[PDB]
Design a binder for this molecule. Structure first.
Ligand SMILES: Nc1ncnc2c1ncn2[C@@H]1O[C@H](COP(=O)(O)OP(=O)(O)NP(=O)(O)O)[C@@H](O)[C@H]1O
Ligand SMILES: Nc1ncnc2c1ncn2[C@@H]1O[C@H](COP(=O)(O)OP(=O)(O)NP(=O)(O)O)[C@@H](O)[C@H]1O
Ligand SMILES: Nc1ncnc2c1ncn2[C@@H]1O[C@H](COP(=O)(O)OP(=O)(O)OP(=O)(O)O)[C@@H](O)[C@H]1O
Ligand SMILES: Nc1ncnc2c1ncn2[C@@H]1O[C@H](COP(=O)(O)OP(=O)(O)O)[C@@H](O)[C@H]1O
Ligand SMILES: [Mg+2]
Lengths: 50, 1595, 264
């Protein structure tokens, strides 16, 4: 979801989440938050987020 | 769905679907509005059903509620029938008026439940002790009002000591009460149940009559003991008669009352005159009574009278001490504090009320004795610390505060509180606070304590968790405030109904009640109760005085010196001896030891008395007791109780400490001549050494004797030695020896508890359709209890041969305790009979609870109880008398002959092996070649833990095969059999060869050479005389002389059809050695195991060697983290079958005359439990060692007949692996398959390349020069790059096979090539297999230079510029053939295809730069190869997961990606693998199976994939009807491809080949920063199986 | 009365299997056929005026034909099955070999029916009760084999004892040693034992009454008969090794532990 890995099939734009393949609506936006300022995130997440 | 619709209401595009959404919202709400009610209407009904049909008497108690529940049950059953006829949710929702009907049912069921709760609360309040009883138990009590026997088990919860009620023969009148010990109190006035039919009424009358009769008997007891109080001399007979006539509690109370009254009268009489004569008289009387009791206790007494005498002695010693203190202090007034501070008893018989007759006073406190029957309780030695505890606690009770005796563990805190409560006659109820804290009854228990009047002590209140601590703290705070409200003077108690808020009700609090909170510092009491509780530091109890009083109680003449010696000795043992969990030098152990010493003393008195009586003598118990050593009895008791638990390292330290504390006193072991003779006979019968102590085998004989002693004493015991110490053999010998000694048949029931599930072990209750299924242990217990075949006459021992864990021993705690009762969820209570003895074998008790260890006796079988000499003697004895070929039919005939006369020449095999034992005896001596070799080998490091018995069993099996080989030579040379000279040379060489392959068979080649050098130093046998060859490289021929293994390895030629998949292994030196060992260790049916680094070749060698044998039927099972005994049971059900025989049920393969062998490819990989045991490994261990297992469904023993196991492994150092149990590694001989090395690789790939070059006939001459290069560079890489620099720099022959496959696929479509083109393809494959995995640029430069160097070295006169240009690229897109292409043309083609890809699948620009075209080509290349799996590792981003998709789209591979959910069990991954495999193989649809680290979080499912990566088929996926469907689709696909196949095996092989060709796996990972993940660095097997590509970061 | 009840008849060829069952059917001439023969007994309850049939399946002497048992009994009909092992008293030296051979063949068939182990333990426990619940009109030295199903051993041609005594020098000790071995085998399978002759009509009514008693619950009053060497009758649940040991009092040349083929 952070990487925007849309899979397009006809008009259905799926994205995998757990078992389900859900339809990405255009309006979706997510903001991640951290109250802890002492955190070491993985390099996997750093490339996927600003 | 409701939340999602509510969220959809906020969507900007919601207006279009609004009306439809609203409709569903209504339906969704209605569905919830139904089922939220429905579950309630179900639960209450189920609950009410469980109450209204379980008891038939509930109808009479609650008729109206019964009728309402009948009318409700009918309606609910009708509704449920209607639902059953249409179980759809929408069909159910549309039932007419279902909502109103269910609401009516909920309301009425709630009303009936409320009525039942009110009725039960009324019954509880009528007889308050029921508040200590649970709801189901109270319902059982009231319902079974007419079946009084069922009530007998619940009295232990309600009353302090009443275990049962004595009843008239017709059960209409209660005559008295009885304790656990059998002590009975007969009521003066019986309670007539017929006149008071209600349970509460006659139970209240029983309590009242118990108190009245106890008071009336205490009156008579005091009246009688007053005579002894005022008498100068006491007649022992009258005193003993008085003790017998009255209960222990009344006896001690009478003694205390008499002493208190006598001292009070004395102090009144002295009255300021200073005349101390009356106190001297009191002390004289007390001393006379003490002398009478000391004389009486040495005699033999019944147990109850002995307990009464011990209590009286313990009380009178304290009375003597107090009177001596008063005389020394010159106390001369009854109101002096020195007398008031001592507890005093004032009995006023004239009081009409029977609860204010005895008044117990201490300083201010003035309690009354609540006459609650306590039975024969354990009295406490009134030390000064306990006296302080009593004083402070009574002061706190007088001030209405709570009590808090805090201190370290085992300091008498809870026991002291219990003793104080029992001294005042108040019911104490200790609440444990260690994971058994039943909260749901705690409010009920508090209300019961408040209403009835009873104490409550929380043992270790610190151990409650924070929520539990806070809630209980609040409840106790409310109770303590209610109690403190009594103390105020203004509140007049004529009308003062004190109350407390408990369970949202005003509960009346009686003043007699109190609460105590024991604490363990390290700490403080909760802040709620710090003000309300008085704390006392019970830091250090008085060990010396407790020991003194107890030893005096047992009749020891000297107690002061013995106590002062034994007490420091225990602390000395606690400090000096090595800390172990099972050691227990606490006060409970000391008191038990002293009681044992008293028992031993009394036994010695009886022994001397009977010995003198058989002679002519005059007998007196006191005279015999006078001239005995008390120290010898005490040291004997200490040794008998402690030495069995002592480790061999600690026994000499213990003896040194005992000599220091007890100088000049030694413990001579009691001689058991008969048992020792029987042990000698059985040991000779079973080929075991026996010794008379301090000889070869003395320690083992001593340990079995100790085992006999512990079995005699306890009803449950354990053997907790390390693996290979003879505990199981010792127990077997003991049973077979007692069989002869006592003429009682010994039966053994051996159970592996961890192999079987707890539900099967103890039997599980069906949650519905109530029926009981007996578990295995319960089945055995029921079988012995019923005694259909007279099992009570026989003696049966149950042995739990497996690791002890808390989970499966919870039910066994009740049996192992003094109760001896197994309780099951069925409600049945099985009484263990005296014949049963529950036994345990454990390598260690690391995960055993202290509760389990305390209940059981123990004999620690230290590893130095079985010397090497004993095992060698066992081996040589087995050889001389067990024919090695006759098998099991003649096993029974071994017992037919007591000596087997005339059967010395049973067969030529016996003679040959006897001669072999004669040749082998000089090398098996205590300081022979084998012993020195083993001691040196123990120094060497081995990948698996080196245990002595594993090496010895391996060596014995190899020697067995040596004599079998001699027998084979004799059979093949009937005209002249083996001569003794050739036999001597052959066995002498074979012993060295077997020594090397048994000891250094688990080590590397260098260490095998080291052991060979050491053997060459110490051996007298000649060895090979070739300098630069290891000894292990040589075989021993049938003739004595050595011969190199290289002669026996043929040079073969492989077909071009199978150049990279000849599953038949190319014969190499390691392969021939390992198959020779495989045959040698399979001849004995031992479970072989092979370890080694990934790709070493163990699986192929095992399969080829097993399939070479004609009889062996291989079943390929692959183990994983989730594998269990179920896999092996399913495999047995598939290939094998159970058949009944008179010996017993036997499991055998369906195919006659074939040995079924199970391949367990990854024995290490199964996950350990929380307690460090693999279930399947234990299951295999019990099968291989006991030769069978227990069918759980039938709960019956079955024996394997032709089943074997042979496993493969990676070393346990690898991340996903685990070490194996030492009880399991003992049986299996482990071989280490290291990498082939240069010579073996050259031979193998010479065969492969000679096969590969057959396609082009002009390049055959260049086969051998190429093969060295493929080896040389590979070895150079193996020397330059190691796992230390990067975790994925792993090399193995799998890389070489990939190289061969790559060259083969390059050359297959090509009609011809020049030598330079072959060199170019070789260099390209080198770069694509080795240069890609590298991380650093300079390493890539080194590989670039080294490829050129190796090529020009092995291909001279070939110009480098034409043969190998640096920008080497091979591609198939430009032309139909796989031929070299230029960079620019490939750049243009890929750019065009990428621009196409932009507007086809994903609209995001993708730039082609120099370092991404190369990755595109690499990914395409791995896609073209067979079994081509890629592992892209690199920085986050950089193209992985985007290049893989791009190349997959370009090559037409449909991309499949796994979607892991939560609760995504391994079955879901199995189904996904089944679907993709069916698509790839049956439908011939190429798939790129992309996997990412995000969905590869769990490593459990990534070992199912390793089988696919290595072989392309994962056995066990399609088992069942899925196999039939896959076979049908597979044959349809084969017909589509044009091949007609019939056999299922050939169709499966073709399906596997299709899966190899089509399905590809693309793993994507980040570099090794995933330490937090379970993978850490993923397994090196995964690195080996795939082709690794380092993506790196953009330059 | 219940329908679908079955009788499985086993034994060597020439033992009497077809002749015994044909005579019990009230027929003079039953047609002999290689493989698996079939006939039915008509059963009538005079106290109730009702009548049913019992299926009788007779296996050939050749082990080649043991596959045909699948057409006689199933995992469903086994609870409704009585087993008859036919022992040939004109060839006593084949009786223990025959009884072990046929019991093994039946067991090899029961194991192949894959009966649910719970249902097998229900039948086994019921048969242990149907054997312990015997009394003349727990303690154990019996049912080592425990077929767990009704079993009857029928000795046929017992009149041939009068030829063994005259042509092979057989004596009371040989007949009691045969009787003890037969009784020990009957204890292993929880079986009944009956001696019969179709030529002298000995025990034919007793065999029919015992079959209908164990199969349909008919009343039975005959006690054990152990004094007549050629007419012995022992019902399932009557016997034990102490009742067998009385036969050892007549042993003068053989022992209770000596092998059957060494003496017979
Ligand atoms: N003597 C040999 N002849 C031919 N190929 C060999 C030989 N020895 C090793 N190999 C190759 O070595 C590779 C490893 O084979 P394999 O037996 O699957 O290793 P492995 O140890 O079983 N892998 P694993 O089970 O996970 O530990 C294959 O490519 C084999 O072809
Ligand atoms: N060569 C390229 N040119 C342009 N964009 C690229 C290129 N390679 C990757 N991207 C973009 O980079 C983003 C992430 O690429 P991707 O390789 O899928 O991440 P990733 O490696 O899969 N991270 P992860 O899956 O957690 O290992 C996507 O938006 C791609 O379109
Ligand atoms: N008294 C003895 N004399 C000689 N050899 C013995 C004696 N007792 C045991 N052994 C040898 O030691 C082996 C191991 O002993 P035992 O079978 O009791 O196993 P154990 O110590 O319980 O080990 P494990 O942990 O493997 O179960 C025996 O198989 C036998 O070879
Ligand atoms: N003063 C004493 N007199 C006799 N026995 C004592 C005395 N103090 C302690 N003990 C023994 O030591 C043991 C200590 O255990 P317990 O009091 O139950 O828990 P803890 O002491 O850990 O609070 C008891 O079983 C008790 O028999
Ligand atoms: Mg053991």
């Amino acid at each position: 979801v952070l990487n925007r890995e849309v899979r397009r099939t006809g008009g259905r734009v799926l994205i995998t989440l757990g078992d389900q393949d859900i339809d990405l609506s255009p309006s979706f936006v997510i903001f991640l938050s951290t109250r802890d300022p002492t955190v070491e995130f993985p390099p996997d997440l750093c490339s996927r987020v600003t | 769905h409701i939340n999602s619709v509510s969220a959809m209401k906020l969507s900007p595009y919601y207006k279009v679907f609004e009306e439809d959404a609203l409709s569903w919202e209504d339906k969704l709400n209605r569905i919830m509005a139904l089922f939220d009610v429905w579950i309630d209407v179900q639960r209450r009904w189920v609950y009410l059903e469980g109450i209204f049909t379980g008891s038939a008497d509930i109808k009479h108690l609650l008729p109206v509620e019964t009728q309402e529940f009948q009318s409700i049950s009918t309606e609910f059953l009708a509704l449920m029938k209607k639902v059953s006829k249409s179980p759809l949710v929408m069909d159910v929702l549309n039932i007419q008026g279902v909502q109103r009907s269910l609401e009516r049912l909920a309301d009425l069921l709630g009303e009936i439940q409320k009525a039942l709760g009110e009725y039960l609360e009324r019954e509880r309040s009528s007889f308050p002790r029921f508040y200590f009883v649970g709801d189901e138990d109270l319902l059982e009590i009231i319902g079974n009002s007419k079946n009084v026997a069922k009530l007998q088990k619940h009295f232990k919860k309600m009353f302090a000591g009443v275990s049962s009620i004595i009843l008239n023969e017709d059960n209409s009148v209660v005559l008295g009460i009885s304790s656990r010990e059998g002590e009975e109190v007969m009521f003066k006035t019986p309670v007539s149940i017929t006149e008071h039919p209600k349970i509460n009424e006659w139970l209240t009358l029983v309590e009242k009559e118990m108190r009245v009769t106890l008071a009336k008997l205490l009156a008579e007891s005091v009246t009688e003991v007053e005579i002894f109080g005022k008498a100068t001399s006491i007649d022992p007979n009258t005193y003993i008669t008085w003790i017998d006539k009255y209960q222990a509690q009344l006896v001690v109370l009478s003694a205390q009352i008499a002493w208190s009254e006598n001292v009070e009268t004395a102090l009144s009489s002295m009255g300021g005159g200073g005349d101390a004569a009356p106190l001297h008289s009191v002390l004289s009387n007390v001393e006379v009574t003490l002398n009478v009791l000391a004389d009486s206790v040495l005699m033999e007494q019944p147990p109850l009278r002995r307990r009464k005498l011990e209590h009286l002695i313990t009380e009178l010693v304290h009375q003597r001490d107090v009177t001596r203190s008063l005389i020394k202090s010159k106390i001369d007034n009854a109101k002096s504090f020195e007398w008031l501070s001592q507890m005093r008893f004032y009995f006023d018989p004239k009081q009409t009320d029977v609860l204010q007759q005895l008044s117990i006073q201490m300083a201010n406190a003035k309690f009354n004795y609540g006459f609650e029957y306590l039975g024969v309780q354990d009295k406490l030695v009134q030390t000064p610390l306990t006296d302080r505890c009593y004083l402070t606690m009574t002061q706190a009770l007088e001030a209405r505060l709570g009590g808090s005796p805090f201190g370290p563990a085992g300091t008498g805190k809870t026991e002291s509180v219990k003793a104080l409560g029992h001294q005042l006659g108040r019911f104490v109820l200790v609440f444990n606070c260690d994971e058994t804290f039943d909260f749901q009854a705690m409010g009920r228990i508090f209300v019961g304590l408040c209403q009835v009047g009873a104490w409550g002590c929380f043992d270790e209140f610190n151990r409650l968790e924070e929520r539990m601590l806070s809630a209980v703290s609040q409840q106790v705070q409310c109770i303590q405030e209610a109690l403190r409200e009594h103390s105020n003077p203004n509140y007049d108690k004529t009308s003062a109904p004190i109350t407390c808020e408990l369970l949202n009700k005003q509960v009346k609090v009686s003043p007699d009640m109190a609460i105590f909170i024991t604490m363990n510092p390290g700490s403080n009491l909760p802040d709620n109760l710090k003000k309300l509780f008085r704390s006392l530091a019970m830091t250090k109890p008085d060990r010396q005085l407790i020991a003194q009083v107890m030893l005096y109680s047992q009749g020891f003449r000297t107690a002061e010196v013995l106590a002062n010696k034994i007490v420091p000795f225990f602390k000395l043992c606690d400090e000096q001896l090595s800390s172990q969990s099972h050691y227990d030098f606490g006060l409970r152990a000391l008191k038990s030891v002293l009681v044992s010493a008293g028992n031993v003393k009394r036994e010695r008195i009886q022994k001397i008395k009977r010995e003198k009586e058989e002679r002519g003598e005059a007998v007196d118990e006191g005279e015999i007791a006078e001239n005995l050593p008390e120290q010898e009895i005490l040291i004997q008791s200490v040794c008998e109780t402690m030495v069995p638990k002592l480790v061999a390292e600690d026994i000499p330290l213990l003896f040194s400490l005992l000599s220091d504390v007890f100088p000049g006193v030694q413990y001579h072991r009691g001689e058991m001549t008969a048992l020792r003779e029987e042990l000698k006979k059985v040991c000779q019968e079973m080929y075991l050494t026996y010794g008379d102590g301090e000889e070869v085998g003395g320690m083992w004989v001593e340990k079995v004797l100790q085992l006999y002693q512990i079995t005699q004493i306890n009803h449950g015991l354990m053997m907790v030695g390390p693996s290979g110490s003879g505990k199981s053999m010792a127990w077997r010998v003991l049973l077979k020896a007692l069989e002869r000694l006592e003429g009682v048949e010994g039966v053994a029931h051996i159970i592996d508890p961890k192999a079987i599930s707890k539900d099967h072990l103890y039997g599980t209750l069906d949650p519905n359709t109530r029926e009981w299924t007996d578990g295995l242990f319960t089945h055995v217990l029921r079988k012995i209890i019923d005694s259909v075949r007279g099992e009570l006459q026989k003696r049966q021992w149950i042995v739990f041969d497996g690791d002890v864990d808390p989970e499966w021993v919870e039910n066994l705690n009740s049996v192992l305790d003094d109760n001896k009762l197994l309780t099951l969820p069925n409600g049945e209570r099985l009484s263990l009979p005296p014949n049963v003895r529950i036994m345990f074998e454990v390598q260690d008790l690391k995960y055993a609870t202290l509760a389990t260890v305390s209940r059981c006796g123990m004999v620690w079988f230290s590893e130095d109880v079985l010397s090497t000499d004993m095992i060698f003697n066992n081996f040589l004895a087995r050889l001389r008398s067990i024919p090695l070929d006759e098998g099991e039919d003649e096993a029974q005939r071994r017992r037919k002959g007591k000596e087997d006369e005339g059967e010395e020449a049973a067969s030529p095999m016996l003679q040959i092996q006897r001669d072999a034992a004669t040749i082998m005896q000089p090398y098996f001596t205590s300081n022979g070649l084998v012993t020195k070799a083993l001691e040196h080998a123990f120094q060497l490091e081995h990948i698996m833990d080196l245990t002595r018995l594993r090496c010895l069993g391996s060596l014995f099996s190899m020697l067995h095969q040596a004599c079998r080989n001699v027998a084979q030579y004799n059979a093949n040379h009937p005209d002249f059999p083996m001569q003794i000279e050739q036999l001597e040379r052959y066995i002498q060489r074979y012993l060295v060869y077997a020594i090397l392959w048994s000891l250094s068979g688990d080590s590397r080649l260098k260490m095998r050479a080291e052991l060979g050098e050491y053997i060459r130093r110490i051996t007298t046998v000649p060895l090979p005389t070739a300098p630069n060859i290891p000894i292990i490289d040589y075989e021993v021929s049938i003739s004595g002389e050595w011969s190199p293994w290289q002669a026996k390895v043929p040079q073969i030629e492989v077909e071009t059809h199978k150049v990279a998949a000849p599953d038949v292994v190319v014969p190499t030196l390691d392969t021939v050695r390992h198959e020779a060992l495989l045959y040698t260790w399979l001849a004995e049916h031992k479970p072989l195991v092979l370890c080694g680094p990934p790709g070493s070749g163990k699986t192929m060698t095992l399969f080829s060697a097993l399939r070479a044998l004609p009889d062996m039927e291989v079943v390929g099972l692959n183990f994983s983290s989730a594998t269990t005994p179920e896999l092996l049971l399913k495999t047995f059900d598939h290939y094998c079958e159970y058949r009944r025989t008179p010996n017993g049920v036997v499991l055998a393969p369906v195919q006659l005359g074939k040995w079924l062998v199970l391949f367990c490819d990854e024995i290490n990989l199964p996950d350990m439990d929380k307690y460090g045991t693999q279930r399947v490994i234990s299951f295999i261990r019990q099968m291989v060692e006991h030769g069978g297992f227990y069918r759980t469904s039938d709960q019956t023993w079955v024996k394997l007949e032709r089943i074997q196991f042979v496993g493969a492994c990676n070393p346990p150092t690898d991340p996903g692996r685990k070490p194996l149990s030492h009880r399991f590694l003992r049986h299996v001989p482990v071989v280490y398959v290291d990498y082939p090395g240069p010579a073996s690789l050259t031979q193998i790939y010479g065969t492969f390349n000679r096969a590969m070059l057959r396609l082009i006939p002009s390049l055959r001459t260049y086969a051998e020069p190429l093969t060295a290069a493929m080896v040389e560079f590979y070895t150079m890489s193996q020397e330059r790059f190691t796992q230390d620099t990067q975790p994925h720099y792993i090399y193995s022959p799998r890389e070489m096979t990939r190289w061969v496959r790559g060259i083969f696929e390059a050359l297959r479509p090509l009609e011809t090539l020049p030598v330079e083109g072959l060199i170019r393809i070789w260099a390209h494959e080198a770069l694509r297999l080795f240069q890609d995995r590298l991380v650093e640029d300079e390493e890539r430069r080194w590989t670039d230079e080294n490829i050129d160097t190796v090529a020009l070295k092995h291909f001279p006169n070939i110009d480098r510029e034409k043969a190998m240009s640096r920008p080497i690229l091979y591609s198939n897109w430009l032309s139909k053939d796989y031929i070299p292409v230029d960079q620019e043309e490939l750049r243009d083609y890929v750019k065009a295809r990428l621009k196409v890809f932009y507007e086809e699948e994903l609209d995001v620009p993708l730039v082609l730069f120099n370092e991404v075209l190369d990755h595109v080509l690499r990914i395409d290349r791995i896609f073209r190869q067979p079994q081509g799996h890629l592992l892209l590792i690199g920085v986050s981003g950089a193209g992985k997961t985007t290049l893989s998709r791009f190349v997959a789209w370009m090559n037409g591979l449909s991309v499949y990606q796994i979607k892991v959910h939560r609760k995504y069990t391994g079955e879901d991954f199995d189904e996904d693998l089944r679907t993709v495999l069916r698509r790839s193989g049956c439908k011939n649809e190429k798939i790129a199976f992309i996997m990412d680290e995000s969905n590869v979080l769990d490593s459990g499912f990534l070992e199912r994939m390793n089988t696919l990566l290595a072989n392309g088929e994962v056995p066990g996926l399609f088992e069942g009807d899925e196999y039939a469907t896959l076979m049908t689709q597979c044959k349809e696909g084969a017909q589509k491809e044009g091949l007609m196949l019939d056999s299922h095996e050939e169709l499966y092989k073709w399906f596997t080949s299709q899966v190899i060709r089509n399905l590809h796996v693309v793993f994507t990972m980040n570099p090794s920063s995933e330490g937090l993940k379970d993978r850490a660095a993923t397994s090196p097997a995964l690195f080996n199986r795939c082709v690794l590509n380092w993506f790196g970061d953009w330059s | 009365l219940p329908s679908g009840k079955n009788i499985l008849v086993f034994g060597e060829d020439g033992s009497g299997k077809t002749t015994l069952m044909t005579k019990l059917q009230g027929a003079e001439h039953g047609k002999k056929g290689r493989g698996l023969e079939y006939l039915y007994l008509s059963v009538h309850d005079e106290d109730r005026d009702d009548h049913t049939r019992c299926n009788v399946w007779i296996l050939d002497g050749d082990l080649y034909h043991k596959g045909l048992l699948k057409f006689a009994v199933s995992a469903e009909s086994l609870p409704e099955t009585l087993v008859i092992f036919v022992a040939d008293m004109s060839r006593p030296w084949t009786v223990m070999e025959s009884l072990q051979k046929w019991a093994s063949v039946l067991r090899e068939h029961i194991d192949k029916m894959k009966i649910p182990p719970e249902k097998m333990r229900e039948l086994e426990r019921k048969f242990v009760k149907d054997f312990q619940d015997y009394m003349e009109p727990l303690g154990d030295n019996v049912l080592t084999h425990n077929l767990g199903i009704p079993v009857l051993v029928v000795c046929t041609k017992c009149d041939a004892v009068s030829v063994l005594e005259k042509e092979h020098d057989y004596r009371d000790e040989h007949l009691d040693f045969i009787q003890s071995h037969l009784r020990r085998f009957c204890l292993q399978y929880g079986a009944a034992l009956i001696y019969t002759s179709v030529k002298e009509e000995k025990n034919l009514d007793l065999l029919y009454k015992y079959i209908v008693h164990k199969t349909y619950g008919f009343h039975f009053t005959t006690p054990a008969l152990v004094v007549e060497k050629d007419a012995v009758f022992i019902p399932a649940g009557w016997d034990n090794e102490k009742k067998i040991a009385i036969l050892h009092e007549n042993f003068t040349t053989v022992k209770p532990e000596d092998a059957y083929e060494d003496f017979i």
